[PDB]
Structure formats: structure tokens, C-alpha cells
Design a protein around this ligand. Structure first.
Ligand SMILES: *[C@@H]1O[C@H](CO)[C@@H](O)[C@H](O)[C@H]1NC(C)=O
Ligand SMILES: *[C@@H]1O[C@H](CO)[C@@H](O)[C@H](O)[C@H]1NC(C)=O
Lengths: 49, 49
């Protein structure tokens, strides 16, 4: 109800990272989710003020 | 603690729709809530870019 029908702001609830979407799948006495995420890749440090 | 004392961004937690407020009511061996919501009514389709 939280991940599939909306977007979740709870950290590390609908995937590791920043949550985007989700899809449910059926299973033999279970359910399987396919969480989508968003992970920064390349870092370049600077000087701030 | 979440619905009554504030506003919830969790989907389908304090009612079905966009949650606004809540009110608690007592009952024998239980509690009863009155969730207020906000639901769109009339649609109209357009063209977007
Ligand atoms: C960025 O970090 C590296 C080591 O982590 C350092 O050598 C470099 O000076 C840093 N960049 C700046 C602009 O100081
Ligand atoms: C809006 O939807 C109706 C039926 O779904 C369709 O007939 C109509 O063409 C749509 N609006 C526009 C501007 O196409």
C-alpha cells in the first residue's frame, strides 16, 4: 500500500537508496516486489562557503 | 500519535485519499477514529507538452 500506490520518503523501506517505483509479483504463498532505486555514481569534491 | 497530532504522508494510513485531519472517539474495549480526507471529483482531459 505504501510503495506501490505512491512514493515513500521513509529511508530504506522500499529499496536501498532513493525510491522511485515498485511492481508486485505473485508467488506460491508469497509476494515478490521489484523495487526501483536511484544511486549517485561519480563524486568530485569541491570547496564551499 | 501520527494522524491525530499531525498530518500523514503515508498512503492509505489515516484514511483512503489525501489525509487532512482525524478525531478520536472512545468505545468499550477499543477506540474509533473519524478520518477526514480529500477526493477529486470531476475529471477533464487535455493536451500537454
Ligand atoms: C578532493 O579529495 C582528494 C582526496 O580525497 C584531495 O587530494 C583533493 O585535494 C580534494 N580536492 C580539493 C579541491 O581539495
Ligand atoms: C477525452 O476522453 C474521451 C473518452 O475517453 C475522448 O473521447 C476524448 O477525445 C478525450 N479528449 C480529447 C481532447 O481527445
Amino acid at each position: 500500500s505504501e510503495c506501490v500506490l505512491g512514493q515513500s520518503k521513509r529511508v530504506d523501506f522500499c529499496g536501498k537508496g532513493y525510491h522511485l517505483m515498485s511492481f508486485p509479483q505473485s508467488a506460491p504463498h508469497g509476494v515478490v516486489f521489484l523495487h526501483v532505486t536511484y544511486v549517485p555514481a561519480q563524486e568530485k569534491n569541491f570547496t564551499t562557503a
